[PDB]
């Protein structure tokens, strides 16, 4: 290994904060998507925008992917997530079966919340 890819094995505090923020943003996006759908469905039934926003009973999304994203068991929120799953991917060939998320290529775009139950 003569070429030096000087990437540290762990993240800085600032990196971790940025990661957390990014995670929070994707959750927010999902929430917005569900909310807009609900609003649209209220409008279709025949309420005003404000009335729809007020509504006690929020409509859950019917499409599959959205419904999965809504579930925390499948796609957890940043507040829900463990410290470890925010900053460590599962890597079967690593010692500890764990690897920094920053070592994943395009980790800033690519999402990866859920690790295996005991790894």
């Amino acid at each position: 290994g003569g070429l030096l890819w000087k990437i540290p094995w762990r993240m800085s505090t600032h990196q971790k904060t940025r990661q957390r923020e990014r995670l929070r943003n994707v959750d927010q996006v999902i929430k917005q998507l569900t909310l807009g759908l609900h609003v649209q469905r209220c409008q279709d039934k025949g309420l005003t925008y404000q009335e729809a926003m007020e509504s006690k009973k929020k409509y859950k999304p019917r499409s599959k992917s959205l419904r999965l994203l809504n579930k925390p068991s499948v796609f957890p929120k940043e507040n829900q997530m463990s410290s470890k799953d925010k900053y460590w991917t599962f890597d079967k060939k690593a010692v500890g079966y764990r690897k920094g998320i920053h070592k994943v290529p395009k980790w800033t775009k690519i999402s990866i919340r859920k690790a295996p139950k005991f790894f």
Binding site: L33, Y49, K109
Partner: protein, 82 residues
């Protein structure tokens, strides 16, 4: 109701399927704002690119001209010709 979707991240490190999805959605460059009438189809498409994009719901959409007008900064002066 409308999703105001914004292409927050680039499409440089992104695979070709996700690029194609973004193109279909209508977003060109980074930080280029697009309003979409809400429906299941567009929602699913947005979910498919959830990490590149920032979405937020709105009462009304805005045309490109309106958006431009909103953007324009205040010129702090009033011309008086003589």
């Amino acid at each position: 109701v409308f999703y105001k979707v914004t292409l927050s991240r680039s499409l440089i490190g992104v695979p070709h399927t996700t690029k194609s999805i973004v193109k279909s959605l209508g977003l060109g460059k980074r930080g280029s704002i697009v309003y979409k009438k809400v429906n299941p189809a567009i929602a699913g498409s947005l979910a498919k690119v959830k990490e590149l994009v920032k979405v937020e719901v709105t009462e009304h959409e805005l045309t490109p001209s309106q958006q431009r007008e909103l953007r324009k900064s205040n010129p702090g002066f009033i011309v008086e010709k003589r």
